Amino acid sequence: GCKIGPSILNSDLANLGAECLRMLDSGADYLHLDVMDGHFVPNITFGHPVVESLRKQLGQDPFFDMHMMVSKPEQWVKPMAVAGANQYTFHLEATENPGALIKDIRENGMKVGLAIKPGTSVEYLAPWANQIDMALVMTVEPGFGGQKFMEDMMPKVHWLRTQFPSLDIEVDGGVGPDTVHKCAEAGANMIVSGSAIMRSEDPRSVINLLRNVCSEAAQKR
């Protein structure tokens, strides 16, 4: 049940279709698409219009995990659903009413992801864990780096894995061949990796490595 989802912010964004296609051909399990509105985080990447074009090119099969680093996640639920997103991963910090938003995401036919930034206690996420499809533990601060993987996020992953053995747990931020062992041993089964994959001359090899480390750790649990 371990899956690798390349992030594409490090890719040639003027040729996004080609970059996604070669990730899929390289054996990516899903694509992790970072949506930043310049308010929740200090960068603007792309929104649903790009997602819609991507979906049109890639067809119906590929799974899009939308990482919604936006200040008003309620606003983009329907646009992302219409664009063809599979999963809407919103930040717990970005809404006063996560329960209502979770309901809305499901009513719009999408899976539910719930993300926490490094400074947010995993204790805030736990109360909602049985309502979501996937928890995302950030391992860098979103919108800034360009940062080193934060090893002190691993206790969050471990706690979640301990308390919720069946929960899919994703990590995102500086994850690569060098740090995937930490994530996998802590309990993560969904791995987002950007530069490590996208800049590789052999992304299939990198993806296989990442998945194999996770799988090995899962079989040990």
Of the candidates 216, 179, 192, the one whose C-alpha atom is nearest the C-alpha of residue 23 is 192
Is residue 199 close enough to count as binding a copy of itself by CB under 8 A? Answer: no
Q: Is there binding between residue 41 and a copy of itself (CB under 8 A)?
A: no
Specify whether 172 is catalytic.
Answer: yes
User: Is 38 annotated among the ligand-binding residues?
Assistant: no
Compare residues 10 and 212 and give the one whose CB is closer to Fe ion. 10
Q: Bridge partners of 190?
A: 3, 170
Q: Site residues for a copy of itself, window 46-65 (CB under 8 A)? A: 46-50, 52-54, 56-58
Q: Rule CB under 8 A: is residue 72 a binding residue for a copy of itself?
A: yes
Query: Is 146 a known ligand-binding residue?
Result: yes
**Which of 29, 65, 133, 172 is labelled catalytic?**
172
Catalytic residue among 29, 34, 37, 168: 34
158 has binding-site annotation: no
Say whether residue 42 binds a copy of itself (CB under 8 A).
Answer: yes
Least spacing, CB of residue 88 vs a copy of itself, in Å: 14
Number of chain positions touching a copy of itself (CB under 8 A): 35
Instruction: Tell me the C-alpha distance between 10 and 173, whole Å.
Output: 12
Q: Which long-range contacts (CB under 8 A, 24 or more apart) does 47-52 make?
A: 47/76, 47/79, 48/76, 48/79, 48/80, 48/82, 48/83, 48/85, 49/83, 50/16, 51/80, 51/83, 51/84, 51/85, 52/82, 52/83, 52/84
CA distance 91 to 141: 12
What is the smallest separation between the CB atom of 96 and a copy of itself, expressed in angstroms?
A: 18
Strands ordered across the beta sheet of 3-6: 3-6, 190-193, 168-172, 134-138, 111-116, 87-91, 64-69, 31-36
Contact between 25 and a copy of itself by CB under 8 A: the answer reads no
- Convert 134-144 to b/e letters by CB count within 10 Å (16 or more is b): bbbbbbbebbe
164 known ligand binder: no
Respond yes or no: is residue 34 known to be catalytic. yes
Query: Tokens 């691993």 belong to which residue?
Result: 154
76 binds, among a copy of itself, Fe ion, none (CB under 5 to 8 A by kind): a copy of itself
The footprint of a copy of itself (CB under 8 A) covers 9, 11-18, 20, 35-39, 42-50, 52-54, 56-58, 70-72, 75-76
Binding-site positions for a divalent metal cation: 32, 34, 67, 172
Supply the residues annotated as catalytic.
Answer: 34, 172
